[PDB]
Structures are given as structure tokens and as C-alpha cells.
């Protein structure tokens, strides 16, 4: 019967993909990189300490002006900070105090948040009556909303725990495109610089590359052994890095459809909560569960420095657009700025 | 002091915001937070109505004490990805139906509901985030259990049962079997109540359990516990 053939066709296609990927590799990145100068010892000092949150900080996001922050904690308040002067611009109470993610629009007019309430709330920062209101509430996910990223002032992509990413339209509050294919809960989400593709990490130890305007998965990336919790594009948009719970960061190339380099150490036995890059892409910053953040040489696979100073688990990382500073937020209700 | 008028006004705004957050912080720091769990629909609706699309919160006050009860039903997701948000809860309320040992898991055949409830209790009580969080266990529908035990022996659910086929010993055996799953007996307690009561006794039981938990926490703070 043809049922056996239709069952084995998936395995045959997987084997063909694996063989094509293996035949496409000739020289590792370490072999090409061992003949370039090391970065050195990168030392950063805490320059600002933003205080005012009273519970675990779960997410942060930088503004496009590299000055305004947004932070979310379990108290149920979103705080917009002025990083230069350590000042609070706004304090927005939330209907649901269980928030996991926050976002800052590129135009700076909107802030989004969501969590266990299955709802992404959009907040209008610039109102004529002088207070931050709710533009609308986006409903339609059957699981907790884990990540949200703004594409423009009218579109926002949301990552949820229902094994599905969705693209929304804030003018009508509807779901323009639905992305399916993941098996487990989808945890992280990062957008391409040109805002045409985005990668998505899930709990099935896999990452996928999507097309925004077509709703079609293009590539799938394997290699991890546990849940992926963070993901971030390279500045040129041709690579991305993933952090998982097996105490290891990977680097993947979209054009080669392969893993280039792994980042791990024997002393590291704790999971990874956040992954971020530098402006040039040479330095990769990873927040860990053992109370500190490590700085990695993205080309030499070497530890360039350690960002210690947090008394609890580092849960969120962020690098400014101009690359001037990096902001770490932990579960000790503190935000630190580094240079 | 090297500051403009607008900068000083922004500083004053920041100070007012700090004051508002401080007020909200000590407003919310005196509210008891409880987390409610239960396998399927065991006693969730009964325990909610006795106190009259994702997480559901319920507000009620009892003897100058406000309560925050969170329900995590219909959250078909991995528990380990959001269970660390409830580290600071005062107590965990667990609802188990007594009249389900004769029932099948409906969605899955050849499976007992009591065993699923026991596995959920074992997962919750032995978690890394709830080492020192006390558990209030509610056993619902004792009348249905009492009127159903006269024809269906408990041996089908528990083959090792060697007791009388009546209400008191069977209920004691079930309570003991739920309590034996606690592997952290030196750091937390389990409060068990039979909660098929028309009168307003479940709220009182919750109040006494929370008072005991608060006394133990205060004694740990002062070094006497």
C-alpha cells in the first residue's frame, strides 16, 4: 500500500535536508576566525540604577532614541524611564498584574504589554487630555502571551503559548495573519531590521523563520536540547542567536540554513533568559540564571567579560540602537545601565 | 543647581510618581494572595460560589482582611513556563473531588481521575518554587461519596485498601494517601478540610489557615521558627 510510502516520505525529506545541509559545510567559523585578533577583556561599569519597581521585572525594551526605556513588573505597572537623568516619565497601571512582555513603538507614541490574561493591551502615550489610555485590547490567543514586537504604528506581531504567532491590525483589532507550525509553547520573538521576516523560538527545541506578508514558514532550525527562551537577529539580518535552558547559545545562518557556532562553558549549568547583540555584531550579551550576564565574542567563542551586580535572576537585556549602553533587568526589582 | 526649570519640574513629577507607587506598594503588600488549583472541574465552582479568558481573580474580604484568589483553569500550556510568577503566594488551595474514584478521565480512557489528581498534587507540592508554601487541600462532594460508596468499593481505585467499606475510614485513607506525597514535611504543612458544607465554614477554614501561615512566617522573620 501507499500508506507506508506517505509515512516514510517525511523521513526521506528530512534525510535529504540533512544531507544537503551537511554537504553545504566545508570549513567551520572557528577555523576561519582563529587568525583574527581577540576582542580582549571587556569591562563595563554600572552607570545608572533605576529604582521604583517592587516585584520581579519580567521585560524591558529600549526606545529608538536610545534614551527612553519601558519596564514591566508583577506589581501591574509599566514605567517609562529617562535613562539619562534617572527620571520617571509615566507610570501606567495595568488591568492584569501578570505581565511577561512589553514593547515600545519605533515612533514612540505607543507601549504594548501582555501576559497571563491572553490580551495584548496597546497604550497611547501622546494624548490631548494628558494621561495614558488604552487604545484597544487585542484578544484571540488561547494561551499566555509571551512576546510582542511593533512593526509600525498600525501592526504588531504577538507570540503566545498556544503554539501560534499572530499578526494584528490595531485599527480594527483583528488578526491579519496566523502563523502555525510550532509544537510547544512559543517563548521569544525577534524582528528583522527591514521588517519583512521574523524568527521565533519555541519549547520544542526549534526555531522557525517566517514571512510577514505571506504567512509561510521558510526555514526551520534545530540543534538545541531544551526550551529556547531568547532569540535575537544579527545587525545585518542574515543571522540570529538563540538562548536555551541547556546553558548554551547557538548561532544560525539563514543563507546556509545551518548552525555556525555554539557558545557554552563547563562552569555554566544554568539556563539563559535573554540574548542580545552589539551594534557591530561582535559582542553577544547573554543573561543567565546564575545572577549575572556574560559577554561573549560572537566570532571567537570566548568570554570577553562578566556583568555582575544583580542579586536575583537576570530576566531581560537590551542594547541601544546607537550601541552606547546595555540595560539589564533582574528579579530583584532593579534596572542597571552599563558602559 | 545646574538644572533648568523644566528639568526641576520633571524631577518633581518623578517624585510624585514615586509617592504614588509607594502608596500602591504598601496598599498591595497587606493583601493575602491565594492560588487555586484543581483537576478539571472538581470543586472550583462550588468553592467560588461559597464565597459570595485566562487567569481569573476573585476579591473578597473577611474580618478586615482582603484576599486575592487566582484561578489558572483553562490554561492549556506548559506549567513550568508560568508557575514561577506565583512564588510569593501566601498559600495554595487545592480542590479534589471525592466522588471520582469510580470515574474515567473522559478524554483518556482506562484512566482514574483520582490518580491524575494525585500526580498534580505531587507535582505542585514538590516544586522548586513552592518549597515553603503551605497547601490547603479541599475534598469536595462528601455526600456523593457517602451515597456512592455503598455499592462501589474503594478497592478499584486503590487495590491495596484493606479497610472497612464505609465513609470515615475511606476518607481517612484518602487523606493519608494525599498527605504522604509531601516530601518536604520539615518546611510546610497541609491543611485538609471536608468542604461539602452549606454553611459558611470554608471561608473560616481559609482564614485560620492563613493566620497560621502568617504566624509561622513572622516567627521565621524573628528567628523563633
Amino acid at each position, epitope marked *: 500500500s501507499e500508506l507506508d510510502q506517505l509515512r516514510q516520505e517525511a523521513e526521506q525529506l528530512k534525510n535529504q535536508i540533512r544531507d544537503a545541509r551537511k554537504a553545504c559545510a566545508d570549513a567551520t567559523l572557528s577555523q576561519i576566525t582563529n587568525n583574527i585578533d581577540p576582542v580582549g577583556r571587556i569591562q563595563m561599569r554600572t552607570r545608572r540604577t533605576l529604582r521604583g519597581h517592587l516585584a520581579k521585572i519580567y521585560a524591558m525594551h529600549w526606545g529608538t532614541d536610545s*534614551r*527612553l526605556l519601558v519596564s514591566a513588573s508583577q506589581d501591574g505597572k509599566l514605567i517609562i524611564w*529617562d535613562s539619562y*537623568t534617572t*527620571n520617571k*516619565v*509615566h507610570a501606567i497601571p495595568l488591568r492584569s498584574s501578570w505581565v511577561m512582555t512589553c514593547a515600545y513603538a519605533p515612533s514612540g507614541n505607543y507601549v504594548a504589554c501582555g501576559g497571563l490574561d491572553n490580551i495584548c493591551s496597546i497604550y497611547n502615550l501622546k494624548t*490631548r*487630555e*494628558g*494621561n495614558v489610555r488604552v487604545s484597544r485590547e487585542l484578544a484571540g490567543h488561547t494561551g499566555y502571551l509571551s512576546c510582542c514586537r511593533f512593526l509600525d504604528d498600525n501592526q504588531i506581531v504577538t507570540s503566545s503559548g498556544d503554539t501560534t504567532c499572530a499578526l494584528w491590525d490595531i485599527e480594527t483589532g483583528q488578526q491579519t495573519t496566523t502563523f502555525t507550525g510550532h509544537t510547544g509553547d512559543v517563548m521569544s520573538l525577534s524582528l528583522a531590521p527591514d521588517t519583512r521576516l521574523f524568527v521565533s523560538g519555541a519549547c520544542d527545541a526549534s526555531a522557525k523563520l517566517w514571512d510577514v506578508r505571506e504567512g509561510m514558514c521558510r526555514q526551520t532550525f534545530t540543534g538545541h536540547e531544551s526550551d529556547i527562551n531568547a532569540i535575537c537577529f544579527f545587525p545585518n539580518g542574515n543571522a540570529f542567536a538563540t538562548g536555551s535552558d541547556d546553558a548554551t547559545c547557538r548561532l544560525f545562518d539563514l543563507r546556509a540554513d545551518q548552525e555556525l557556532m555554539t557558545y557554552s562553558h563547563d562552569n555554566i549549568i544554568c539556563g539563559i533568559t535573554s540574548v542580545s547583540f552589539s551594534k557591530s555584531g561582535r559582542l553577544l550579551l547573554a543573561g543567565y540564571d546564575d545572577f549575572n550576564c556574560n559577554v561573549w565574542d560572537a566570532l571567537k567563542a570566548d568570554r570577553a567579560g562578566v556583568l555582575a551586580g544583580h542579586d536575583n535572576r537576570v530576566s531581560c537585556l537590551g542594547v541601544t540602537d546607537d550601541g552606547m549602553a546595555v540595560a539589564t533587568g533582574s528579579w530583584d526589582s532593579f534596572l542597571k545601565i552599563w558602559n | 543647581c*545646574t538644572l*533648568s*526649570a*523644566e*528639568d526641576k*519640574a*520633571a524631577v*518633581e*513629577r518623578s517624585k*510624585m510618581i514615586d509617592r504614588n507607587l509607594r502608596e500602591d506598594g504598601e496598599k498591595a503588600a497587606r493583601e493575602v494572595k491565594l492560588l487555586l488549583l484543581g483537576a478539571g472541574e472538581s470543586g472550583k465552582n462550588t468553592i467560588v460560589k461559597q464565597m459570595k479568558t485566562g487567569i481569573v481573580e476573585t476579591h473578597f474580604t473577611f474580618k478586615d482582611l482582603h484576599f486575592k484568589m487566582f484561578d489558572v483553569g483553562a490554561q492549556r500550556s506548559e506549567r513550568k513556563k508560568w508557575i514561577h510568577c506565583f512564588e510569593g503566594v501566601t498559600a495554595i488551595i487545592f480542590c479534589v473531588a471525592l466522588s471520582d474514584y469510580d470515574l474515567v478521565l473522559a478524554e483518556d480512557e482506562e484512566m482514574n481521575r483520582m490518580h491524575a489528581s494525585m500526580k498534580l498534587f505531587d507535582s505542585i507540592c514538590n516544586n522548586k518554587w513552592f518549597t515553603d508554601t503551605s497547601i490547603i487541600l479541599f475534598l469536595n462532594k462528601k455526600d456523593l461519596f457517602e451515597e456512592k460508596i455503598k455499592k462501589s468499593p474503594l478497592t478499584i481505585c486503590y487495590p491495596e485498601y484493606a479497610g472497612s467499606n464505609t465513609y470515615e475510614e475511606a476518607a481517612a485513607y484518602i487523606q493519608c494517601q494525599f498527605e504522604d506525597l509531601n516530601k518536604r514535611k520539615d518546611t510546610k504543612e497541609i491543611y485538609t478540610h471536608f468542604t461539602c458544607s452549606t454553611d459558611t465554614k470554608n471561608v473560616q477554614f481559609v482564614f485560620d489557615a492563613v493566620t497560621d501561615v502568617i504566624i509561622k512566617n513572622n516567627l521565621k522573620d524573628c528567628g523563633l521558627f
Partner: single-chain antibody, 234 residues
Framework: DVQLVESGGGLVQPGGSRKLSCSAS????????MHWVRQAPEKGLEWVAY????????YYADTVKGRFTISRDDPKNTLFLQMTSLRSEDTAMYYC??????????????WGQGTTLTVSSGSDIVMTQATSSVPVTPGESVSISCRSSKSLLHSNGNTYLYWFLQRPGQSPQLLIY???NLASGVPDRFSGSGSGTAFTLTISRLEAEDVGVYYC?????????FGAGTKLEL
């Protein structure tokens, strides 16, 4: 529907007392600082008093200290001004100005209708507009220049200079709030430029809707000082 209605005017004998009331309806009154500005019939704008959010900072002009009192009632959304020892120089039309201060804010954004009050019988920054009346034809550009005795460029890179337009028989409105930034609703044809002590407002493709008087105000240090005013005609 932002509104600021002032009442309590009329004719007052010299040496008397009068309370001015400013009622707000359409915005969060508690989060905005409030200003009082009066305009004498000599066609000039003069700053009077300021009260902050939370009533933690109150400022007065040198000509009203010890005899004018400003207070706000945030439950009732009403702003008060208690005026004592009235002189003949206090005969003016008083405006209620709304201001908010954070990073990237737009203070002096809304002005009230105004009330008319009639009385019978050194270190301050000086800002001067040389042109007091210039003719203009619709469909042509125009530039208005304002200068200051002290440089308004602070160490933080902000140049605190504001531009206002008052049409005949109307209330002033904000055009540029820090030397380059257009306010909400202002057409793009208005531009701000300058640095230090020289400033210029450019109005390309002027229409009959832009005919009025233009003012330059500094917000570097209290008291806030306006200009004489450049009047556009024809």
C-alpha cells in the same frame, strides 16, 4: 473637548479685592501645572503666577508678590487667583494657561478664553522683537526675528524658546515650543531656527489665517519674559 473657562471680571475700585476662577473640563487637571498670564490694552503679554502639580512649587512675578495669591482645587477642577491691593496697572485681560513638564513635553499648549478686569481711575531676561508691524501678501514667505540678552542654550542641549500667535479677538496658541518643534495641529509651513541669542520663525506660503501678532517667550528661568510682539497686516 479641552476647555478652560475664566470668570470673575468686571469693574473694581482701586485698593479692593477680587477672586478669579478658572474652571477646567476635558483633561486630567491634577497632572498639569497652571499659569496666569495677563494682557493689558497696550497689546503686551505679561506673566503673573504659576502653580505646579501637587501644589509643591508656586512662583510669582515681581509686580504681584505679596498681594496676589494663586491656588488650585483638584477635586473641583478649578484654579483660583486671589488679588488684593488692586492698582490701575492691573487693568488687563487674564488668561488661564495649561502646562505639563516631562521629557519631550509641550507646555503652554492650551489657553483659556480670558476674563476682562477693569480698575477705575535687573536680572530678568530681556527679549526684544525689532519689527513691530510688517506688511505681507498672501502666498509669500516671511521671517520674524527675536533676540535675547542671555543665551538660552542650556548645558543639556535644549534651547528654551517658545513661539505664540494671537489672532485678532482670540486667544494665543503655541506654534514652536523649543526653537524647532511644531506643536500639535500646527501646519508644517511654520519653521523654527536659530542658536544662542538669535532666533527666526519662518512662515512659508502665508495665508489670511496667519494674520495676527507673534510673541517669543523664554522658559529658561523664572520669571518668564515675553516680547513686544510683531504684528502681521494685509
Amino acid at each position: 473637548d479641552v476647555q478652560l473657562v475664566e470668570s470673575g471680571g468686571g469693574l473694581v475700585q482701586p485698593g479692593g479685592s477680587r477672586k478669579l476662577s478658572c474652571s477646567a473640563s476635558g483633561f486630567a487637571f491634577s497632572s498639569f501645572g497652571m499659569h496666569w498670564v495677563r494682557q493689558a490694552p497696550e497689546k503686551g503679554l505679561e506673566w503673573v503666577a504659576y502653580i505646579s502639580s501637587g501644589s509643591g512649587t508656586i512662583y510669582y512675578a515681581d509686580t504681584v508678590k505679596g498681594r496676589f495669591t494663586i491656588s488650585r482645587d483638584d477635586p473641583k477642577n478649578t484654579l483660583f487667583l486671589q488679588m488684593t491691593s488692586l492698582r490701575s496697572e492691573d487693568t488687563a485681560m487674564y488668561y488661564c494657561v495649561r502646562s505639563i513638564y516631562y521629557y519631550g513635553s509641550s507646555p503652554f499648549d492650551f489657553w483659556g478664553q480670558g476674563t476682562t478686569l477693569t480698575v477705575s481711575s535687573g536680572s530678568d531676561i530681556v527679549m526684544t522683537q525689532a519689527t513691530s508691524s510688517v506688511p505681507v501678501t498672501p502666498g509669500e514667505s516671511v521671517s520674524i526675528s527675536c533676540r535675547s540678552s542671555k543665551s538660552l542654550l542650556h548645558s543639556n542641549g535644549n534651547t528654551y524658546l517658545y513661539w505664540f500667535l494671537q489672532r485678532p479677538g482670540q486667544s494665543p496658541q503655541l506654534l514652536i515650543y523649543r526653537m524647532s518643534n511644531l506643536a500639535s495641529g500646527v501646519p508644517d509651513r511654520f519653521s523654527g531656527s536659530g542658536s544662542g541669542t538669535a532666533f527666526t520663525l519662518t512662515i512659508s506660503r502665508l495665508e489670511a489665517e496667519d494674520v495676527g501678532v507673534y510673541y517669543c517667550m523664554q522658559h529658561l528661568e523664572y520669571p518668564l519674559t515675553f516680547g513686544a510682539g510683531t504684528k502681521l497686516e494685509l
